[PDB]
Amino acid sequence: QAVDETLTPWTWNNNNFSSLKITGENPGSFGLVRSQNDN
Amino acid sequence: TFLVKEDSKNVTAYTPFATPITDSKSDLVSLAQLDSSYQIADQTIHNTNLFVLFKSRDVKVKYESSGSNNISFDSTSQGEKPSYVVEFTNSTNIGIKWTMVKKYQLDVPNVSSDMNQVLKNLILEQPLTKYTLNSSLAKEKGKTQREVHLGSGQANQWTSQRNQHDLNNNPSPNASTGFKLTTGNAYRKLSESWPIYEPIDGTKQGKGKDSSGWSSTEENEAKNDAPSVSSGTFNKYLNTKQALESIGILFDDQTPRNVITQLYYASTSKLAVTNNHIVVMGNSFLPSMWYWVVERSAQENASNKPTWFANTNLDWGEDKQKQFVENQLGYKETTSTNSHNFHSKSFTQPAYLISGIDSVNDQIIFSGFKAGSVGYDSSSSSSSSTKDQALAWSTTTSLDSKTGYKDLVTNDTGLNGPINGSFSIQDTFSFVVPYSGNHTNNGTTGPIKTAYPVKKDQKSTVKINSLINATPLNSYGDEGIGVFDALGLNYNFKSNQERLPSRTDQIFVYGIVSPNELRSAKSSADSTGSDTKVNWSNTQSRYLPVPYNYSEGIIDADGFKRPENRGASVTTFSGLKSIAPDGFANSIANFSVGLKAGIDPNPVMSGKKANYGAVVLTRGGVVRLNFNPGNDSLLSTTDNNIAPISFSFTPFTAAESAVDLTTFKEVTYNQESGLWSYIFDSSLKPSHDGKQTPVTDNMGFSVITVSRTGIELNQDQATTTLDVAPSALAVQSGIQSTTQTLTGVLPLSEEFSAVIAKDSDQNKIDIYKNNNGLFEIDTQLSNSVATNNGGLAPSYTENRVDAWGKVEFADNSVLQARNLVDKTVDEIINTPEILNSFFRFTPAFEDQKATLVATKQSDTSLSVSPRIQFLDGNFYDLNSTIAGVPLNIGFPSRVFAGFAAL
Amino acid sequence: AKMENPSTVQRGLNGEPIFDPFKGFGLTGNAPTDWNEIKGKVPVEVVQSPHSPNLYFVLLVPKVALEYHNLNNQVVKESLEVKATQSSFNPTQRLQKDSPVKDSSKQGEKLSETTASSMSSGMATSTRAKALKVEVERGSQSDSLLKNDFAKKPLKHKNSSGEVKLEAEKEFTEAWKPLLTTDQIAREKGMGATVVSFYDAPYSENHTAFGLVDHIDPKKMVENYPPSWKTPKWNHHGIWDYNARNLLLQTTGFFNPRRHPEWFDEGQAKADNTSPGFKVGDTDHKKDGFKKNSSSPIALPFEAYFANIGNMVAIGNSVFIFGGNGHATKMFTTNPLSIGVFRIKYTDNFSKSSVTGWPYAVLFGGLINPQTNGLKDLPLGTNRWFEYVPRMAVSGVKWVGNQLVLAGTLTMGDTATVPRLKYDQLEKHLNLVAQGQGLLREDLQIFTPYGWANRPDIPVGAWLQDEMGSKFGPHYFLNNPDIQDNVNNDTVEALISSYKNTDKLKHVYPYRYSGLYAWQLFNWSNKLTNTPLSANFVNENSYAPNSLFAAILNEDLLTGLSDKIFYGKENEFAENEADRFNQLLSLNPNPNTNWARYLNVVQRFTTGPNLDSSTFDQFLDFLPWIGNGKPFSNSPSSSTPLPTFSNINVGVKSMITQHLNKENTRWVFIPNFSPDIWTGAGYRVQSANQKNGIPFEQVKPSNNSTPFDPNSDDNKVTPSGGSSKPTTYPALPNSISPTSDWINALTFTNKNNPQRNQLLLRSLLGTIPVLINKSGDSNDQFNKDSEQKWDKTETNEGNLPGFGEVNGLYNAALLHTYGFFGTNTNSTDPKIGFKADSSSSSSSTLVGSGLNWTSQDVGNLVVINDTSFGFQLGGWFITFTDFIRPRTGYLGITLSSLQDQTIIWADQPWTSFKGSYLDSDGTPKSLWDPTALKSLPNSSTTYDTNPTLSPSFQLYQPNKVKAYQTTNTYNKLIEPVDATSAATNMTSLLKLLTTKNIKAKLGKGTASSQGNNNGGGVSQTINTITTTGNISEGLKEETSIQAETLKKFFDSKQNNKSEIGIGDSTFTKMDGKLTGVVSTPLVNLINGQGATSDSDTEKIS
Incomplete structure (x- = not known):
């Protein structure tokens, strides 16, 4: 569940959304990520 | 706490449970010492006082052309029944007991010399009928400008002759003057009595101004045509006894009373409330000369006479609007001193199709349509060419008028002499004159000159007197110019198509009124003899076209019109056809009703107080009326180019447009939420058709709701001032019925509201939600509330889910389980977090929760009082009292034992 | 996939979530x-x-x-x-x-x-x-x-x-x-989308907790379509228009699969005419017209449904999914997109939910011109039948300030095929016959005036009353308003009035209606009128988004609206033709139906800058083309290239006063003492001596039976009195060119607002087509000198085709702007262009632009502030500077271009953009991955295929035209020849129909363009001052028309593209396999790199 450097941030070509600017009490973002594995 | 009329003589207090309260249905006629012939018009709450305005069937007002008191009640026929507005107050031990507070009379208008003389030869067109046909509205055209100026045999020398006839550079040799009054829709004097027969077509039928002819044989012919109770013909006339009675015009069996009495009864229609004033206004259905401005401190027998609209000069928006409006009344210098007219005596548009009245922050607001007033000839000999005719002409702005709404309204066309006629341009027909000033097909050739269409030879021998048009329109003449102006089909050909303001026809009147000028109106009413006019400033008027699509054939409103639109079959009233589904058989004469001002409940930035936007209904589209409370004036922007920011007409859709507009009953402004609601029920519709057929849709009600969207003023400092007119947006709520007849309305809460209706002498309860405007019926909850034991509130049971859910107080040993025995009684009492833990409550809907309050029964054991909300949001208990009456609900108060003393 | 034993929140009895800040959300x-x-x-x-x-x-x-x-x-x-x-x-x-x-x-x-x-x-x-x-x-x-x-x-x-x-x-x-049908995807769960409510605990041992799991069911779309949608092959007209479409071999209905199969769960399998929901084809004419089984309903197949997911936002207790953008399932030419909005609500404090979705047609039904400050008369409205099929390309609905904004593109109702074809004129109008039939998915709007009908809506039985056409067929004839009957009083009340029409009977009038494409559309196109729900003449719904869009949607209203939708009687189609004959645009809906509730939801909308008339196309002239950066005008630095979009300063000035009736025109359409307007390119005149107006030499002789014969006994009308007069106007306008411009002759102009908006969209994209005669081949080269004399365009020297060119622009100027001839594009002149050859007939066609920036392209809506916003479209970056709060005198939008040429010309340049955001500095950016350019799957396999697909490759048909008269070329319409079998003789011309061949000729077919090796970096739109886009001084100046005055303004500020709102986005190169961005309120980081540790507050703990 901890951070895994293998998986990488990305963005899908239907919405292209991987960074929600969060505000309120715990600012940040629900970082959307996928493995950069090609092949 | 809820007060609404079941019938015309009783109001009752209704609980938030939608349960009528026993011994609360007060018979107002008995209460205010009023004879049973009276009836209650409408109620307005202000500082917790159910003010009322009373109207009666027995009212009888006589009219005379001689004597100072030309207008007075029909005393000689036991008919003097002046209307009264009664202040109210429930000053008691907090209880449902209405009592008289102040009984204020509504006095007859006082007629001074000049307006007396004008009224002596004044006539009023018979009213709108819910079955009225456009053909009935229109009626035979009259002789044209040149044909009346140089008579016949005047062609081929128009250019050389029009100069000496104060019509230099006139480009329209076929300018119309109006419609002949020889035959068609009836016109009658105030002394005269209105016919119950409206001619089906104005091309052939009717008798109009010829009262003697109307009496001679047209009376019998029309009665034979459409007799008053299907083998009948009804081919040239339609009896309108039933329609007239339904629309609020009282009859002597078949015949009506005199026009003066009809106008009095019609004007006693609506009431407004101000901290220092309470003003009365006339119903929208038919116009109103006069209105009442009454100080609240007056005596119980105060002779509170009204004030004529003529006595109060409105503000149309521009000095040029004022000039164009006043010019087309009648010839300035008649020289036949006896033939007094509105223009000859420096008067103003006297007849307003008043939509509705309301007051907010002690500021009253009025809106509606402006009825046409024009001169007529009373010569009848040698009879003049124009004699027996209407003197009217649409004063549309010319095509060449430059950009800028202010310029459109300030252009010179249509000052005094008619200019709009038949013309041909490019691949279409701009009925509007394509020229103004000196602009012509060859360029500047001489500014256009115009004057009132009356030949000077008959100036010394023309008997001119004013009339009144019972509709907003001005020139009923069967012509494309008038038809297009009415239906909104004229657009200027420029790249940026600008709508043409029809200057003095189908105009809209609106604008707040200040208490200071209301006091000025009172003082003007006080003045008698030498009448003193009044001026209104915070008021404005702009043209409001009737919905164009209501007319068959017309599809797309534009400037490049289809060739077929030039044909008389679809560019003339008689040929015109109406597809309007709004309960109106016509498609030209507009109608509006149901203004209700309100304060926007949403937050306003600091430094600027709450913003309030007035809204007035109108068929085919609603308009918001916006103001800036910084100066409490009409909302406006510096740029004269753009239209006045205060007004923004928003068109309707099929569903809400089809909502018949002859069913306005009440308006409930849900202040906290900020959403209006215009309730409508088919019961108010006439019982029988014009063709005498019974009405098959007299049962069924629904509502129309208004919200606010777009951009609002003073939300933050960025929008402190605006440049786009804020716009309302009418919608269809969902509360509708086809058989049920409503008893009352209930704006219960932000998220809930209720309705009650009677269909088969049984009360129907349908509690509704409110999702910011849209209401939905919840049967699972509506059925439960019925379990009221015939009482004010529903009962609670622990076997099924009802309006109050399923509350299950924890076991008697919850104290033992939660270690609360060790803690002190004072601690548990002063621990709201722990208090709620004594029970598990399952809500039956949103915004419902159960709680507890500090209570004591014994040191070892203390009871707990269950306190729960309802759809209204008000927490309830055995101690809940409204109007001093405990609500005696019957909560079981759980008792827990095991309280220590450490 | 690999999270073990997750849990949902252990909510309370009434639905509250138990969340101790440290012990965390209660797990179940x-x-x-x-x-x-x-x-x-x-x-x-x-x-x-x-x-x-x-x-x-x-x-x-x-x-x-x-x-x-x-x-x-x-x-x-x-x-x-x-x-x-x-x-x-x-x-x-x-x-x-x-x-x-x-x-x-x-x-x-x-x-x-x-x-x-x-x-x-x-x-x-x-x-x-x-x-x-x-x-x-x-x-x-x-x-x-x-x-x-x-x-x-x-x-x-x-x-x-x-x-x-x-x-x-x-x-x-x-x-x-498709892959999966609507019902198939509905029943299947693992293969369908889903939205899950959950809870995050950044500082609790229970880091994450879950709420509810909710699926999106296309069954809600299917049940929530208006009943008429079930029978798209029909329409409200449905009887005469159905037969006309049959006979002309064109669209059956309004949204048939033949022209739009993406939304048909059977796909093109129903690309036929049979089974339109009404009886059709039966022998007895009266027999046909009654309803029957409908086997062609509209649903949400796999591709459309997936395009219907993306950019969802939540308001209050309910959530909306406003649709994807289609790229995920966008193949090389087919264009699926989101059709119907989705809504989700939640009950008892997020304890249970209902799944529902709506058709965007009812959402957008309530549109009227007063709303938008942009272009008017758009094909956006509808009628009580929802035979209008909107579909939004979503830039991302964002809570911009205090208002909710939806922006991107949507597909206009098809304004191209609004005209029709004469029954015997299908083999010589290849362009438009293909544009309609469905073998040409190109949505720009082609100019073939010769063969239009007098009305596009004449029933077939009224076409052969004059089969020969020598009599000129008053009921039916090829459209040519040179002969248009006068609207004179006597003329109208003699021709049309006497034939009064009752409810049961309607009269087809012998009157010679006519008019060029502009009047044709102003009559039979769903132009927006001040009253909504006011589109009776709706032909069809377009191919791909050709309408930039940005509107404001009522948050409170959309929250209030009910999930399920109920339809009244009027929603479905007429029961029988007896009822149909008397169709109305307004009827009383049954009060027990909630469909019309959803109507008035759109607060406003805009597509371009708040400009009107030819001034808007002057703006179009100003905007530059990324393929070279040179604007269309090219005027800065006598046989010189002329402006292509704007006709100002083109040809010669003609007087509207001499046009048509010659009466009441000096101060109608022009507020000047001298109504001087530019007739445009392709114009004709009598001679240099006399130019204003043209005598009626446009006479059309069908046979060799002498000309149209005005003043003939039939051709002249006689009102009461016997004063015989002709019903055809004396002097006609001097331009029926493809770029014909007429403020007055609304029956001869061609610069309509559909033209204007579609050209805005696809010129911002940069892929507007061209019409060519000669390729770069030796001995077949359209060289410049001695065959391109711009100054003389009346004759063949101007090389104006007049048939097949896209309406609203000039071919020679367009190709000069492209660079197909000259140094504009390539070092060596490509020698590709159009000649107006007079020796014999000329064969020609259209081709792509080389670029391939498709139309569904959209960024992610970056909210600059509460008063402006925007995104990236194609290679450009728009910014709705003055949409929420438009200001008088401001142009309305600001633009930024793209630098990387390799990115510009690559095959699929939209496997490059990897999301957009607002940089904390105050100017958004977008990502570029040149190594991610997903070109065609194969280089035509291995053998060179003349047809090679691409985003913007379409079957641009040949157009073969008769020989041109050397002088006075365009007195009449340039007649077309039977071009059906002209393909084999223009192999070289069709070789350029493929973008790969186009770029090969241009010299930019490979990495030979030089410059940036890959150009992998971040592009930033130009900083926009609040005054940016101001044209306050540009407008007004009523001494002459707005178009010309703003043309002069631009010519005085043409070299200042920054001020107007035109520029190239600043680009910064940083090495890295860029794949996305991450966002923090302090600063958004790129690719997940750039770890920060609160530099300012380092010394606090």
């Missing part, structure tokens, strides 16, 4: 069920609900979308079929080109001229032909009537090698087909 031990079919769904989106506390959603989309583009093409089949096609490539060999013919068995059923004209006290007399009597009476019969004049069908399909008709089972050997 077990997470929401369906682990097997939900663990396998990628998270593509995540949203916050600000109304409720700390609530969050994740958008679970199936991964077949993620790998969609990599699946075998055999299953995912492109709409266009190529195969070996080793026979050159004939763009017309897939178009049904045979015209209809008169039948030899039903001659007597043609519409019959009325018995005797109704005098009706008629003082006016007309010598022309007399009207036709058209009436349909219910009578008494179940499947028939007593008389059906509409159902007369004199014409028939040519019996050429069998019947010519649209029928998929042999007009599509390998037809386009």
